[PDB]
């Protein structure tokens, strides 16, 4: 792919990203001052496990749905057979959700933006997932240290999804090519901005995968104990994770 194609791919990917973000980043930064009372905290901490899970589960569900809309706008994704779109999304939608979190994370006070204000991990205590939730906070913190631009997150998460080494693909070669193109675009943009050095500092893909595995497993257990009701946007994908 030539320079102009690459530039068009970067612009396209970053526009798709911005347009499939729940909240714009300026909002998240405006509100880092708006922090939860200890009264508001204990309020959340005195919530029942189920009502808290319902909140978080619906929040996370909505997030996955924005990520699916992002994928559907990646050049070439819609041209993929339904099987492969499910393979890519089953594996990666939640990996992207986990990456997108670093936006709502404030490494200064170690808090995250949740339901209108910032709170520490203490806020989710009623779920009793301290291990998992501590891990997630560690990951966001780790991503914070890289000071991603919005453009970098867009290209990085595009590559999290468009990965040709996911088990199950049938058009593996078509994915390899969309991936190659996204890698040229990511690398170009990083060079352009003197940020090429972050490539070696990105999370090892294994760490992202395994963390996503822990997280989804836990969520599936909770979905078993206490099903929330989902109006699904990609039914063949929903059926692949909720059954
Ligand atoms: O609306 C949809 O079409 C749709 C909506 C959501 C998903 C989706 N949920 N999910 C979960 O982890 C999940 C969530 Cl976010 C909330 C409650 C329970 C669950 C669980 F049971 F599946 F585990 C995923 C993981 C990986 C990939 C896609 C998804 C998929 C499809
Ligand atoms: Mg240069």
Catalogue all structural domains in the chain, each as residue range(s) with its CATH number.
Answer: 1-243 (1.10.565.10)
CA 33 to ligand 1 center in whole angstroms: 31
In the β-sheet with 117-119, what is the strand arrangement from edge to edge?
A: 105-106, 111-114, 117-119
| Token output for 92 | 């990666």
Tokens 């009701």 found at? 229
CA 188 to ligand 2 center in whole angstroms: 8
CA 201 to ligand 2 center in whole angstroms: 20
**CA dist 213 to 10, 88, 94, 152, 164, Å?**
29, 15, 9, 24, 19
Are residues 94 and 241 in contact, defined by beta-carbon separation less than 8 angstroms? no
Query: Pick from 56, 58, 27, 61: which is nearest to 44 by CA?
Result: 56
Q: Which ligand is nearest to the CA of 188?
A: 2
Q: Which ligand is nearest to the CA of 194?
A: 2
**CA dist 115 to 1, 112, 235, Å?**
43, 10, 27
CA 148 to ligand 2 center in whole angstroms: 18
Query: Pick from 44, 198, 207, 90: which is nearest to 138 by CA?
Result: 207
Query: Pick from 60, 51, 61, 58: which is nearest to 126 by CA?
Result: 51
d(CA 125, CA 110): 15
d(CA 211, CA 97): 12
**CA dist 166 to 49, 92, 141, 160, 175, Å?**
34, 9, 27, 11, 10
Are residues 198 and 112 in contact, defined by beta-carbon separation less than 8 angstroms? no
CA 93 to ligand 1 center in whole angstroms: 9
Q: Whose CA is nearest to atom 25 of ligand 1?
A: 94
Q: Which ligand is nearest to the CA of 195?
A: 2
Q: 112: which strand partners?
A: 105, 119
Q: Whose CA is nearest to atom 14 of ligand 1?
A: 61
Q: Which atom of ligand 1 is nearest to the CA of 235?
A: 3
In a 13 Å sphere around the CA of 85, the CA atoms on its Cβ side amount to 21
CA 35 to ligand 2 center in whole angstroms: 40
d(CA 219, CA 241): 10
Query: Pick from 115, 103, 228: which is nearest to 153 by CA?
Result: 103
- Technique used by the depositors: X-ray
d(CA 158, CA 64): 14
Q: Which atom of ligand 1 is nearest to the CA of 241?
A: 22
**CA dist 90 to 40, 101, 203, 206, Å?**
35, 18, 20, 16
Q: What is the 3-state secondary structure (H, E, C) of 47-94?
A: CCHHHHHHHHHHHHHHHHHHHHHHHHCCCCCCCCCHHHHHHHHHHHHH
Show contacts of 55-60: CB within 8 Å, 24+ apart: 55/115, 56/124, 56/127, 57/219, 57/222, 57/223, 57/228, 58/228, 59/114, 59/115, 60/97, 60/219
Give the number of other Cβ atoms within 10 Å of residue 64's Cβ: 20
Q: Whose CA is nearest to atom 6 of ligand 1?
A: 61
C-alpha dihedral sign at 158, 87, 206, 178? negative
CA 189 to ligand 2 center in whole angstroms: 9
d(CA 139, CA 134): 9
Pocket of ligand 1 (CB under 6 A): 57, 60-61, 64-65, 90, 93-94, 216, 219-220, 223, 228, 230, 232-234, 237-238, 241-242
Are residues 234 and 61 in contact, defined by beta-carbon separation less than 8 angstroms? no
- Cα dihedral angle (237, 156, 104, 212), rounded to 10 degrees? 50
Per-residue burial over 191-226, b = 16 or more CB atoms within 10 Å of its CB, e = otherwise: eeeebeeeeeeebeeeebbebbeebbeebeebbeee
C-alpha dihedral sign at 140, 146, 148, 152? negative
**Structure resolution, Å:** 2.3
Residue 26, classified by CB atoms within 10 Å of its CB into exposed (0-12), middle (13-18) or buried (19+), is exposed
Are residues 172 and 39 in contact, defined by beta-carbon separation less than 8 angstroms? no
């Amino acid at each position: 792919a030539s320079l102009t194609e690459i530039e068009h791919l970067v612009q396209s990917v970053c526009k798709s990203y911005r347009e499939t973000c729940q909240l714009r980043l300026e909002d998240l930064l405006r509100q880092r001052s708006n922090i939860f009372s200890r009264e508001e905290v204990t309020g959340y901490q005195r919530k029942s496990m189920w009502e808290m899970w319902e909140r978080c589960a619906h929040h996370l569900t909505e997030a996955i749905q924005y990520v699916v809309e992002f994928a559907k706008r990646l050049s070439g994704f819609m041209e993929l057979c339904q099987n492969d779109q499910i393979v890519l999304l089953k594996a990666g939608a939640m990996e992207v959700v986990l990456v997108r979190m670093c936006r709502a994370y404030n490494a200064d006070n170690r808090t995250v933006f949740f339901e209108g204000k910032y709170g520490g991990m203490e806020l989710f205590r009623a779920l009793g997932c301290s291990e998992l939730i501590s891990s997630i906070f560690d990951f966001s913190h780790s991503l914070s240290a890289l000071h991603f631009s919005e453009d970098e997150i867009a290209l990085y998460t595009a590559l999290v999804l468009i990965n040709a080494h996911r088990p199950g693909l049938q058009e593996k070669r078509k994915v390899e090519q969309l991936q190659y193109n996204l890698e040229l675009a990511f690398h170009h943009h990083l060079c352009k901005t003197h940020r090429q050095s972050i490539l070696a500092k990105l999370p090892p893909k294994g760490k992202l995968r395994s963390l996503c595995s822990q997280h989804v497993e836990r969520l599936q257990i909770f979905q078993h104990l206490h099903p929330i009701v989902v109006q699904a946007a990609f039914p063949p994908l929903y059926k692949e994770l909720f059954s």
